[PDB]
Amino acid sequence: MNTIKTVIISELEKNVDEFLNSYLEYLKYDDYDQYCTMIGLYDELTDQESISQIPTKYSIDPINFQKFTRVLTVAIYNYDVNYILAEKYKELFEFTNMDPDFSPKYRFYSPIATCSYLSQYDLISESFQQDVTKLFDRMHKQQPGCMLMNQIMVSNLIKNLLKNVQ
Amino acid sequence: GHMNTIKTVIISELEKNVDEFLNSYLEYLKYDDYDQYCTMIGLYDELTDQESISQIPTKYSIDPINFQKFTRVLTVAIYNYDVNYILAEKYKELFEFTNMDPDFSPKYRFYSPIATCSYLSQYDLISESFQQDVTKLFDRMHKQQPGCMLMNQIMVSNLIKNLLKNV
Amino acid sequence: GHMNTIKTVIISELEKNVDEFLNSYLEYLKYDDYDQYCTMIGLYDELTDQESISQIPTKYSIDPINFQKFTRVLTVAIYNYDVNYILAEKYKELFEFTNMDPDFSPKYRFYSPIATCSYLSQYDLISESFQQDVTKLFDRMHKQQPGCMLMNQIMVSNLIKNLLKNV
Amino acid sequence: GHMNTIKTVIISELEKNVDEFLNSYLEYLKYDDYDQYCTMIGLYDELTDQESISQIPTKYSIDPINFQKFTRVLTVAIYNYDVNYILAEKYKELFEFTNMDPDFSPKYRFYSPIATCSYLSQYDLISESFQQDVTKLFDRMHKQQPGCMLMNQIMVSNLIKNLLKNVQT
Numbered sequence: 001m002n003t004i005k006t007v008i009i010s011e012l013e014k015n016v017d018e019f020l021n022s023y024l025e026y027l028k029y030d031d032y033d034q035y036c037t038m039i040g041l042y043d044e045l046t047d048q049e050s051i052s053q054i055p056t057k058y059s060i061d062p063i064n065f066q067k068f069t070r071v072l073t074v075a076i077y078n079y080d081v082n083y084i085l086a087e088k089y090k091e092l093f094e095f096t097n098m099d100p101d102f103s104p105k106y107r108f109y110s111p112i113a114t115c116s117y118l119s120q121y122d123l124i125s126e127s128f129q130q131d132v133t134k135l136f137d138r139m140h141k142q143q144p145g146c147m148l149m150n151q152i153m154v155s156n157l158i159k160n161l162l163k164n165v166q
Numbered sequence: 167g168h169m170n171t172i173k174t175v176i177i178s179e180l181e182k183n184v185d186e187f188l189n190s191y192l193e194y195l196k197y198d199d200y201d202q203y204c205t206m207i208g209l210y211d212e213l214t215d216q217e218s219i220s221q222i223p224t225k226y227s228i229d230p231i232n233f234q235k236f237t238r239v240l241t242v243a244i245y246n247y248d249v250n251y252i253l254a255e256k257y258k259e260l261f262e263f264t265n266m267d268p269d270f271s272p273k274y275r276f277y278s279p280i281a282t283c284s285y286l287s288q289y290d291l292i293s294e295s296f297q298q299d300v301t302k303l304f305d306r307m308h309k310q311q312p313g314c315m316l317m318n319q320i321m322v323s324n325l326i327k328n329l330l331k332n333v
Numbered sequence: 334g335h336m337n338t339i340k341t342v343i344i345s346e347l348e349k350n351v352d353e354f355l356n357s358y359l360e361y362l363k364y365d366d367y368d369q370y371c372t373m374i375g376l377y378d379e380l381t382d383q384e385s386i387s388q389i390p391t392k393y394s395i396d397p398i399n400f401q402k403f404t405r406v407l408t409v410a411i412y413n414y415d416v417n418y419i420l421a422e423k424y425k426e427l428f429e430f431t432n433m434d435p436d437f438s439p440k441y442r443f444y445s446p447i448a449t450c451s452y453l454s455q456y457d458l459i460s461e462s463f464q465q466d467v468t469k470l471f472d473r474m475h476k477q478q479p480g481c482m483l484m485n486q487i488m489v490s491n492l493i494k495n496l497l498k499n500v
Numbered sequence: 501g502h503m504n505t506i507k508t509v510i511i512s513e514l515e516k517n518v519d520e521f522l523n524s525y526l527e528y529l530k531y532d533d534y535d536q537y538c539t540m541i542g543l544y545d546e547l548t549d550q551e552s553i554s555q556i557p558t559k560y561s562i563d564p565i566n567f568q569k570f571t572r573v574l575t576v577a578i579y580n581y582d583v584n585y586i587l588a589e590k591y592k593e594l595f596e597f598t599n600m601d602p603d604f605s606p607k608y609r610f611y612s613p614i615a616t617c618s619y620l621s622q623y624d625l626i627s628e629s630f631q632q633d634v635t636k637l638f639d640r641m642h643k644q645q646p647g648c649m650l651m652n653q654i655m656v657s658n659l660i661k662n663l664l665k666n667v668q669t
C-alpha cells in the first residue's frame with residue numbers, strides 16, 4: 001500500500017494465491033474447504049503466535065495446516081525476488097522446517113505445471129526439501145528456452161525496481 | 167513515498183527494455199543504415215518535442231527514410247513495453263510525427279525483443295498500412311505464444327499497473 | 334585446378350539466375366520483341382569481345398536497337414547477381430559497348446527478378462542517364478525492402494564470396 | 501588441387517554458418533548453461549566418432565543434459581545448412597548418438613539463424629517427439645517465408661549442388 005516493496009509483496013502474494021488455487025484441484029471434501037480458508041489467511045502466518053492460534057481458531061486439522069504450509073513454501077519459492085517473501089514469512093519457515101535461503105536459479109514457473117508435479121509428492125515427508133529441489137530442477141531441464149528467458153526477464157525487472165529507493 | 171517518482175522510475179525501467187528492443191533490430195541492418203540507426207539509439211529519448219524531431223535528421227545526417235523507419239521500430243517497442251500509456255504520453259510528440267495510433271495497446275505485451283523483431287523484420291516499415299501490420303504482428307505473436315509465457319506477461323503488466331496506481 | 338572449377342561453376346550458376354532474370358523481362362515484351370530477346374538470352378555468353386559484340390545484329394538478324402536495349406537489361410541483371418565482379422570482368426567489353434559503369438555494385442544484390450523488372454519497366458533503357466536511373470532503381474528497392482529479405486540477400490552474397498576466396 | 505577438395509571447401513563454409521547458428525541460440529541460455537554451451541561450440545567438429553562423443557563431456561565438464569541439448573541444437577543447424585547430406589555424412593556418428601534422423605531434409609534450407617533459433621526456443625529440446633517438432637519447425641518457416649527469400653535459398657542450395665557435381669567422393 002505504501003512503498004515499492006510493500007506493493008510488490010502484495011502483487012507477488014496475488015500470484016501466490018493463484019498458485020494455491022491451482023493445487024485446490026487435488027483436494028477434496030473438508031480438506032478442500034479448510035485449504036480455501038487458509039488461502040485467505042496466510043499473510044497472517046508471520047509470527048509463531050498467529051501460526052499456533054489460527055488452525056484452532058478456524059477449525060483446520062493439524063495435518064491440513066501442515067500440508068497447506070508446505071504448498072505455500074513452494075509457492076513462495078516460485079515467486080520470491082531478493083528473498084523479500086522469505087524474510088516476511090521468516091517465522092513460517094521455522095514452523096515448517098524448510099530452508100528460507102533456498103532459491104531456484106529460475107523462478108515464475110507455471111502454477112498449473114508446478115502443482116501438477118507437486119501433486120504426486122508426499123508433502124509431509126522428511127525428505128520434502130530435496131523433493132522440492134528436484135522438482136524445480138526437473139522443470140528447468142524440461143523448460144523451453146523462450147520460457148526461461150521470459151522467467152529471468154520477470155525476475156530481473158522486479159529486481160531492478162526494488163533497487164529504487166530514490 | 168507517493169509523488170510522481172514511481173512513474174519516473176517505471177519509465178526508466180521500461181526504456182531499458184526499449185533499448186534492448188532497438189538493439190535487437192540492429193541485426194537486420196548493415197552499412198549506413200546500421201550506422202544511422204545506432205546514432206538514433208542514443209538520441210531517441212530526445213524525441214519528445216516537435217523541434218527536436220525536426221532537427222535530428224538534418225543535424226545528425228540521418229536519411230529521412232531511415233529516420234521514418236527508426237521512429238516506427240521505436241513505436242513498436244513502445245507498444246510492447248508501455249503500461250497505462252505512460253510511454254505514449256511521454257512520447258506524445260513522437261506519435262504526432264509518426265501519425266501512429268497512440269491509443270493502441272496489444273492484448274498482451276512484454277514479448278521477447280528478439281522474437282518481436284524477427285516478426286517485425288518481415289514487414290515494410292514505410293508501408294502506408296503499417297498500423298494494420300503492427301496489429302497483425304502482435305496478433306501473430308499472441309496466437310503462437312504458449313500460455314505459460316502469456317501468464318508472466320500479464321503478471322508483469324499488472325505489477326507495473328499496481329505500482330503506478332498505489333505508488 | 335579445383336579453384337578454377339569453383340570460379341567456372343559459380344559463373345555458370347550466376348548466369349543461370351541471369352537467365353531467369355531475362356526470362357522475367359520477357360513478360361514486358363510482345364510479338365516480335367519476344368522472339369529476338371529469347372534468342373539473345375541464349376547467346377549473351379558470346380559478348381566477350383568487341384568484334385563479336387558488333388557482329389551480333391548481322392549474324393543473328395537482330396534489330397540494332399533491340400540488341401542495345403537487351404544489353405542494357407542484361408547489365409541490370411549482371412548488377413543484381415554479380416559477386417567479386419566476376420561477371421563484370423568476364424563481360425568487361427560489354428560494359429565498354431554500353432558505356433555503363435563496370436565498377437558499380439549496389440549495396441545489396443539478388444533482389445527479386447519480378448520486383449526488379451517491374452520497377453525497370455518505368456525507365457527508358459537507352460536514355461543517356463540510364464546509369465543514374467539504375468542507381469535510383471537499386472536504391473529504391475533497398476529502401477522498400479524488409480529487413481529479413483536484406484539479411485537473406487547479404488547472406489547469399491557472403492557465402493558465394495567466401496567460396497571464391499583464394500582463387 | 502584435386503576436385504575432391506571442393507567438398508572440403510564447402511564443408512568449411514557450411515560449418516561457418518553452423519557456428520553462427522550455434523551462437524544465435526546462446527541468447528536463450530544463462531549462467532552455467534551458457535558456459536557449457538559456449539565450450540561445446542568450439543568442440544563440435546570433434547564429434548565424429550563415438551569415443552570422442554563419449555569423452556568430450558567428461559573432459560570439459562559438460563553436464564549430460566546440456567551435452568544432449570547441445571547436440572540437438574547442432575542437429576537442427578546441420579538440417580538448416582546441409583547440401584547432399586555432406587554434413588550428415590561427416591557427423592553420422594553424432595546422429596547415432598542423438599538418434600535423430602540422418603536422412604531428414606527440409607523443403608528449403610539456409611533459413612536465417614536468428615529466426616530459426618527463435619522458433620527452436622519454443623520447443624522442449626529433450627522431448628521424445630523432438631523429431632516431429634523439428635519437422636513442424638521447418639514446415640512453419642516454409643509456410644511463412646516470402647517467395648523471394650525462398651528463391652534465394654533455392655539458388656544457394658543449387659549452387660552448392662552444382663559444385664558438388666565435380667566431386668566423385
Ligand SMILES: [Zn+2]
Nearest residue numbers: 334335336501
Ligand atoms: Zn585444384
